[PDB]
């Protein structure tokens, strides 16, 4: 009630200790500068950003039951952020750019009206995004850049609990682990996750069709680029300084909405991408694994090997090795005679995926050695059309199906494939 608000405001004045000329002098805090109250003397707004404040924040803040907007940003307030639990009308919370040293796990408990949270640039002790946030079903904006956020990106941030989430900014924290698949379906429009140690692939982006701005640079993301054709509002895509593999997808190259793309410093393969003239492209020379230094089709041998790599799920070691346009110099697993590929030898490379029928297109092949990997599927019939093939070793994989009929002088070894001959 109004007496409770009066007491809480007096406690806040004491903790913050504002200057004598700040205007918190009247016996009725509803008459104080930068405070808004209802006609029945309930506090609804406290708006004292950029006010040079130096104290701490009283825990009695949580007693202001009708508080809607709390702005304390760009001061020098220290100590812990008090629990705000129970402030069911709090709609806007701005604490960015202060000196807060911690934020508690129950801080968002029962904050059902919360729409916008900004707590960037505070020297918080390490903390994880808390479960208490899950009651903010109308949450639209959550910003906590440079706030020492740790752990994984929690899956509860998906549309199942945050159907209105629009801005999620968590740059320059300590996040690790992979993107949770529960983000699928999210209507987030601006996503900042740059500048930490996130890993895994970014396939979940395919299911986030409201994205306009995606900043994932400076992480440890890997794997090939996903299908972008569904992201018809995507304007700004920053993927630089990661470990992405595979080619730049045509689905991205033809995306009409695209305005800015950053691809520098990855392990992207295939031909150099050509974007529309209107797109600002950040792609430093020699900062990926493209076959040429400028746009143009790759060498025929390279094209074949890249199809083979694709079927092997773009092996990370090959993405970093198979650079340039000459497979006969310094490529993992590749030997040549007079420029013709004679050996593809990738034993013990933890390969996944399947054996591409494109092996059959490399007519100079003498040895295909793929033993001790995690390959599945069948041995393609196309391999029997290799007239110089001497040895096919596919030992110790997870292959199945009938072995096609090879010439009677081809050495074939399927040792250690328990399902060879079985159908699946
Ligand atoms: C957070 O919000 C949940 C509901 O949202 C769901 O969980 C969130 C964490 C998040 O995942 C959301 O996306 C998701 O939709 C609230 O949960 C509801 O809480 C109320 C009570 O607080 C429950 O109401 C009770 O229902 C009982 C039957 O299931 C019923 O027996 C109870 O009646 C008894 O109590 C009432 C008074 O409360 C009394 O009037 C009755 O006479 C009787 O004794 C009562 O109605 C809902 O079942 C919960 N689930 C819903 C609504 O889906 C949760 O409270 C909230 N928590 C915080 C901290 O804000
Ligand atoms: C992503 O690339 C864009 C386009 O190159 C970068 O934006 C440009 O930044 C330069 C500064 O280096 C500005 O002077 C240009 O005006 C910007 N162009 C824009 C915004 O269209 C952007 O900085 C890159 N992002 C990262 C994280 O490196």
Swiss-Prot record:
Tissue: Expressed in roots, leaves, stems, siliques and flowers.
Location within or outside the cell: Cell membrane
Disulfide-bonded cysteines: 30-37, 291-298, 328-336
Effect of deleting the gene: No visible phenotype. Reduced auxin-triggered phosphorylation status modulation of RAF-like kinases (e.g. RAF20 and RAF24). Tmk1 and tmk2 double mutants, tmk1 and tmk3 double mutants and tmk1, tmk2 and tmk3 triple mutants have no visible phenotypes. Tmk1 and tmk4 double mutants, tmk1, tmk2 and tmk4 triple mutants and tmk1, tmk3 and tmk4 triple mutants have a severe reduction in organ size, a substantial delay in growth and development, and a decrease in fertility. Tmk1, tmk2, tmk3 and tmk4 quadruple mutants are embryo lethal.
UniProt record similarity statement: Belongs to the protein kinase superfamily. Ser/Thr protein kinase family.
Subunit structure as annotated in this protein's UniProt entry: Interacts (via extracellular domain) with ABP1.
Protein name: Receptor protein kinase TMK1
UniProt source species: Arabidopsis thaliana (Mouse-ear cress)
Lineage of producing organism: Eukaryota, Viridiplantae, Streptophyta, Embryophyta, Tracheophyta
Gene that encodes the chain: TMK1
Residues of the full protein shown: 24 to 447 of 942
């Amino acid at each position: 009630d109004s007496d409770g608000d009066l007491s809480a405001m007096l406690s806040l004045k004491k903790s913050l200790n504002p200057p004598s000329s700040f205007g918190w002098s009247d016996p009725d805090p509803c008459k104080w500068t930068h405070i808004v109250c209802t006609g029945t003397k309930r506090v609804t707004r406290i708006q004292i950003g950029h006010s040079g404040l130096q104290g701490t924040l009283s825990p009695d803040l949580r007693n202001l039951s009708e508080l809607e907007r709390l702005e304390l940003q760009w001061n020098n307030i220290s100590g812990p952020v008090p629990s705000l639990s129970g402030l069911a009308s709090l709609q806007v919370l701005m604490l960015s750019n202060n000196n807060f040293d911690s934020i508690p796990s129950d801080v968002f408990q029962g904050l059902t009206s919360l729409q916008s949270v900004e707590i960037d640039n505070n020297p918080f002790k390490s903390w994880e995004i808390p479960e208490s946030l899950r009651n903010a079903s109308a949450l639209q904006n959550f910003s906590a850049n440079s706030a020492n956020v740790s752990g994984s990106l929690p899956g509860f941030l998906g549309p199942d609990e945050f159907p209105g989430l629009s801005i999620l900014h968590l740059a320059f924290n300590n996040l690790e682990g992979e993107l949770p698949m529960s983000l699928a379906g999210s209507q987030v429009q601006s996503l900042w996750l740059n500048g930490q140690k996130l890993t895994g692939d970014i396939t979940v982006l395919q299911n986030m069709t409201g994205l306009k701005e995606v900043w994932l640079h400076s992480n440890k993301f890997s794997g090939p680029l996903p299908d972008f054709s569904g992201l018809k509002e995507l304007e700004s895509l920053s993927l630089r300084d990661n470990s992405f593999t595979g080619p730049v997808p045509a689905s991205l190259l033809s995306l009409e909405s695209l305005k800015v793309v950053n691809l520098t410093n990855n392990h992207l393969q295939g031909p150099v991408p050509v974007f529309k003239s209107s797109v600002s492209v950040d792609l430093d020379k020699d900062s990926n694994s493209f076959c040429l230094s400028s746009p143009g089709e790759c060498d025929p041998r390279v094209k074949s090997l890249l199809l083979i790599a694709s079927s092997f799920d773009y092996p990370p070691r090959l993405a970093e090795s198979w650079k340039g346009n000459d497979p006969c110099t310094n490529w993992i697993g590749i030997a040549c005679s007079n420029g013709n590929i004679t050996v593809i030898s990738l034993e013990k490379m933890e390969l996944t995926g399947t054996i591409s029928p494109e092996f059959g297109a490399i007519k100079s092949l003498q040895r295909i050695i793929l033993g001790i990997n995690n390959l599945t599927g069948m041995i393609p019939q196309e391999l029997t059309t290799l007239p110089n093939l001497k040895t096919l070793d596919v030992s110790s994989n997870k292959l199945f199906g009938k072995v096609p009929g090879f010439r009677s002088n081809v050495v074939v070894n399927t040792n250690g494939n328990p399902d060879i001959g079985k159908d699946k």
